[model samples]
Target: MSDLHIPGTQSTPAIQGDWQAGRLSMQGDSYPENSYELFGQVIDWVERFLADGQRPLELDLRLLYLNTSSIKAMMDILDLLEEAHQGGRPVSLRWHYDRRNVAELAEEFREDCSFPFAIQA
Candidate 1:
């Protein structure tokens, strides 16, 4: 499978994922003009990647901020991984939050992530 990487911009986060390593890494802010399209592309690529049966996945999110819409998109990304883990794919999520508020936000996101997940402060 192919890898997807989108360099960070003023309004969007850096997007990097690798099918070979079963990894997804995102950092910076997310408040784009079109949140759906922005994150939808990542979701599409991940779905395609997972269809090939990649194992031992990890999502490392070092997010500074995320708007409401993008938050849902984040859920979609984790949702895919959640399903893959349920199917015995060994998926995990590593969240890095710099502040208490961000850590709390990640706590909320934790409910959505069914696979192994951790918070680094």
Candidate 2:
């Protein structure tokens, strides 16, 4: 597996994934012209990476803001991880945020997940 890198833009986050380290991170804002266009690639890459089922996965999300569509995409990714963990795969998520509102959003997201999910401010 190769590392994943998607440069950040004014309206999108920078997505970085390290195959060797088994770590993935999304940072910055997310409100691209089309949420699916960006998240589609994300979901596809994550699916392929997880399919190997060799190393445990760690997700670190530091997104500052997310539009409604981006929120849906984020949930899809979370659902994927949630299902993977439920299926006995070793996967965890850490949400890093700067604001109280984002931390609350993290709490809301953590509520529906069964895997290990952490939030930090």
Using TM-score as the measure, which candidate wins?
Answer: 2
Query: How many clashing pairs per prediction, in order?
Result: 0, 0
Across 9-84, the per-residue lDDT of candidate 1 in tens digits comes to 9889998997777788998999987898888889998888778765576889888878989988888888888888
User: Which residue ranges in model 1 land beyond 4 Å of their true spot?
Assistant: 100-102
Q: 1-121 in candidate 2: lDDT tens per residue?
A: 7788999999999999888888989999998889999888888888988898757999999889889999999999988888888889998999997765537778889998999998987
Candidate 2, residue 25: lDDT: 97
Q: Give the Å shift of residue 92 in candidate 2.
A: 0.8
Query: Global CA lDDT of candidate 2, please?
Result: 0.88
